[PDB]
């Protein structure tokens, strides 16, 4: 699609991962998703107009362009490729497969530079391309995806979860928040052996006894708005009331185990439909920015168990 | 009144509870009141349109006409009696005591059809008429009412919870989530020994060991929506702050206990004062209309102790 | 200023604290703040329209003007000083310094005169007043403040509590909920010794096993509104997701510790900044009344360790 | 009989309840019981010799003889009646009639003259004749016990608890430390309506979240060693793995709930099954003298509810 | 050898599982080890003296000879196949291969006739071959074993459960209460990808938000007693202390998730290292007497997750 | 005295801390105390022999004589100095005041030759001297005592505890499982703001919320046996019941928080009292040996805070 002609020249114009990055986790690159919503998406602004510094006692750096040059000292460099639907590029809106594709050709070009990708905005769409994107350039390599919504998502066989289930991409699942569960989630749950932890399950167990989830396989996180309750997360379709905390979601997040983050996708908002304070500050806008910033930090602060090390 | 006529008219046309629904809990029928609230009542409306899929893994059905028959397979019919006050059927308001007879009569023949009635919106005076008109027909049966408010409202003599207690209709009375706690609160409290789970202490002893309040007689589940924190359901008269989520809310209302459920009030919600999202959808309605989703299904599940059963 | 001539003039008119008030721990005066915040400030007179009625079985009584006479039987007396600024006294907005004399000069004489300060508005810089207040009049007694904000609010040599830590009239500070901490937040905090409870760290210890913070200092208690989720408390300058809960800050606040209240500081609150129910009541503004509540309750009922006395 | 001739000579010629005493819990009663049990009883014993300083700062006062002085500071009073059976006084043994005829009438005594009964050692017999005694001095009166084993011990007909629920002395049975019910046990539990918390039940809720168990009616506490783990308590007959720690026991006990205690019967210890030090002093008799000393210590400071007093 | 002749003749004397026992779990089979230990095994005998209830609401039925009805009503029947070294059958001394031979036979033609195999005593040998003598059989059947130990013992090539994660007859192993973790035993728990938790992390993350383990596939439970604290279980080789209490064994037990049980080993009991009451009875006896019952009982209860089902 | 001349001999013989040894934390001398305990003193051998991997996976290396080489790898050297008193040096019993110089002179020396002392054995009055013996050497350094015992121990002038505090040496006290506490312990703990977890108190609030003490000054570590509870160290004078389990005592040990650790004193065994195995073994040397072990890992990983660093 020529909407995403202005974006896509220039994340195949970023200079590659640096050499000094060796063995470390990221860099982290992010891009806004509108596959969708409407084509207003104040997501992505509003984040990179958002304080800098994270829960742990770290610091997010954000770059336009290259090269993204490695610190020794608690900062963290984010590449910022801007919104992928250039706007004022026509009145045209973009196709499902045309988002797709956009998405696709991104993220696989920024995954192959060695950049962490990071979508924000859109339907959840983007789930479905940029592990894709990954398993077509790490073949080899196996992917669990730790999914936050409200509803499992995979009773539709169009569906950007199930999809990656059928087409078997996926070699775990892990479904974090669910509190809509219909008949037949709970049939194609079973035929993939997707673990899963409701919300009254979550809630009955104990929040502080969910310490971490455990993972060798690179993890995918697929954070849908809908996860968080209605007072914190308005802004989704078909709301849910009982639902996570900002802070319960981030706690649950800093339990996600694994060698790499394969990517991460923020979805689920509509302007259309957030509760807005008397400055016109949407209340969903405020609440996703601190989960995206935890969640590059996640990136860069990645492994398996929680442990005793060093001296 | 005239206002109830079409309605009224409705209930006593229903065809009573099937030979196949002998031992097993409900059905549910349910109506919406609007006592002491604008004539606009959209809360019954809101929930007869949201997702049918529950916390526990069951699904709702919903049918405005009988007859209602019993289910092999997680299905649980709810019988819509729709409005209590016939909308365009005149100006008038009907009174304390039109609403009183009116909820009386319909509460009376839905309980001697075999339904288990759910009242919707009001002020709460449901609840008087409701386990009064429980207490009519089962004068043999004691009853016990778990009531969620802020407030104990037992202070005023004409408060419904009161009147209950003077004329000495109920054998028991759990007050949950109270933070406003006034001098003749403490003094109707003692007289009645009522049993209470304040804000503070509820929180304080931890909402994970809250896991059942056990019960031998047929429980009466009066919700006001003061309850909640005005973050969640800031749809009510003098909101206090400080109160229970909606998922607090829903943990403590799947551990009661009982026989039988002979009736529920849900009450509180003033649509001019809601906080509403952008697309005007209203914050509390979203959350009452899981909390009534959740105890109908509670109408259906509700047993005596948390047990280990069957092979 | 000449703003705050008709205050003043009313406060050291003031009759001081009775001889039947000696050991016991009060009385409280209160009184409007608002530096660096509009005009409008809607939060004092909020305050004194809510229920009198706190969590902790006692209640709240409120004279305009004297003589505060000492009750035997769970009455709680408030001393209303009114707005700082006096309303229609001009259209001159008061300097940083002349609201800084201002309120020295009122918490001076209040403290003296036997009566416990609790401003309410303002953007925090009545803090620093408030305990140099105190600390002029007794030069002996060391102070001891607990800080509840998102954000340390001590990397700025300008900054309120920043200022009494330069010029070393505090012993001790006691920072809650924090969740934006900069690189200059940490190197501050290392300087003084400050002990913090970030969000983080408060959520995964558990809140049930924070019971009280342990003080035999006289404790000044700073609370900032942005310590609180943006749900609860969305009317503040740069909101900060994943905050307290207004219960969360309730419990909190009640395991304060100490010998006797100097003073207390809720700020924070803008009203063109809150989220508005359709009766044009602001959340915020919900939220803080109850904390200004417990708050009162605290400088009457507050001691060292949580104990088993009496028979 | 006239084994317990010296011993009963001596009981009813102490000098009655003092006049300072009026409307203060207490005073406290103290003998050695001997049913079922070698007629070596080295419990007794063993206790007057232990320290006197209680877990809560309390501290126990021996007297051998009267009058028992009432203090002002932390003071507890105890009355040492010594051991029911006379040493030296034949080769002959008591039968059950007889060590029941004989608990009769010193618990009676001790009863109606002011002092809180507390019986050592024996099979739980005593339990029988402790509550009957009070029965019949105080018919008006109605009795709640709560009861600590491993096994309900109520299948038989001649149980001393079930003789007490088949007369009908009983309001309440509440079952603490269960992990050997039998068939029979649940038949007779669910036709009296027992409270019961098993040991899988209490461990499984945690410990720390069972803070007390409310009552208003009169409390007897019956205490079997065996509801303790082997570990703690080896010194029973059949004894059950899996069962409370002394600290557990302690935990709970502190947690009973009541207007005043009419009794305490510490039984189910065998000298002949004890584990033992190389110095041959007993691990259960250690076990067990802490336990009588906080179970005095409850006699003086039973209440209802765990509340928020005084200023 | 000659010395389980007499046993080995009766074991493939049993007649086989009825066909009532369908798809319902067990029978169980029960026989008695001691490769490693003294010739004087009491263990055994001391478990059929003991009481038969279980902690849950069940009973044990045990018969020497069958057949083994299939019960309607919470019996759960054990087939006692006795000692399997013949007592004096002559002075001699088993070896290593001698037990192991006799141990894959006998679990062998138990499995194949339907029964659950759980062997008591010995040094755990009997773990290695049980699940091999189920693997033979169930070749398809893929095999998951549960291990309680103060110590991992897989450090030894010829350990038994190396051994069996050398020849890959494992799916997964779950290392429960390790405490003394060797340079060796973290290389060879790497290599096999063991799940563990230790000691510290158990009890640092709380007993009771431990609900379960989750598995599929069919699970041995291998028992060391050593997994216990010496103040419960002394009788072992090495002591290590700060481990399991009973009741905390008894718990972890309980959340074992799986299809059915493929076999039960409960060894490291040695009378020559045991701590003995007056009446010489052991201590360990008692406590491990606890754990064989309810893991019978977890050979007919055993499941998947831990829900909400049935009406 | 001439029964401590070999071991002193030895003591000051020793290669001082090497230069690799630097900024580490480090290295631990060990020697036998045996003040107020009877001449046999099998604790110290006892712990030699025992295994040496520790809970947290690291490893102990123990050498008789050095130099004792500072390793790159998991691995803690141990300096076995041997028993003070020498066996077979003569019939005579060295005194109060014999000890303590012995004490503080081996002590002294080993402390400015880079070595942390742990004394083993004993009544505890090498906690005296020690600290002493690093007061005297480190006059600018200030000390905190973390301190585990039934029993505060600070009633008598003469106590080790309040000598300490009455030649005011110590910064801080902190007394952790105290169950026994007198009227004098309540004036002596107030005098000196000494900071006290009762037992009762610490199990109420929760073990598993007990994460760390937090300390900036260096930690001394007293640990009398008493604080454990009888089932798992009955080798101590005047037991009390309701104490820690070995696996509490560690969890609390695994909290000190300090810069380094000045010095180790566990005592309070008496071969004499404890119970044994039929092998002859000592419960309490099996307990107390696994928590000299971790105490001498704490010396090699003690630090402020439990943090996340790193990457």
Known sequence: ???????????????????????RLGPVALFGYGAGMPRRAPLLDFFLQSPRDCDHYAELTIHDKGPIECPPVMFMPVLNCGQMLDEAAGTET?????????????????????????????????????????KRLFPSDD???????????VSDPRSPLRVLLDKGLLKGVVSVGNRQVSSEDRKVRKLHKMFYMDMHAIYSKGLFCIRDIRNDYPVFISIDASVLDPAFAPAVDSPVAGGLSTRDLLHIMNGIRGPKVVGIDVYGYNPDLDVYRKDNVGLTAIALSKIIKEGILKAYSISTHTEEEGM
Chains 1, 2, 3, 4, 5, 6 share one sequence.
Not at 1 to 15: A, D, E, I, P, R
């Open 1 to 23: 699609s020529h909407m995403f002609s202005k974006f896509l020249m220039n994340v195949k114009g970023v200079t590659p991962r640096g050499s000094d990055w060796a063995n």
């Open 143 to 153: 992917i669990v995806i730790v999914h936050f919504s409200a509803r499992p998502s």
């Open 94 to 134: 973009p196709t499902s497969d045309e988002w797709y594709l956009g998405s696709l050709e991104a993220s696989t070009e920024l995954l192959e530079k060695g950049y962490v990708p990071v979508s924000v905005g859109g339907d959840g769409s983007a789930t479905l391309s940029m592990v894709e994107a990954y």
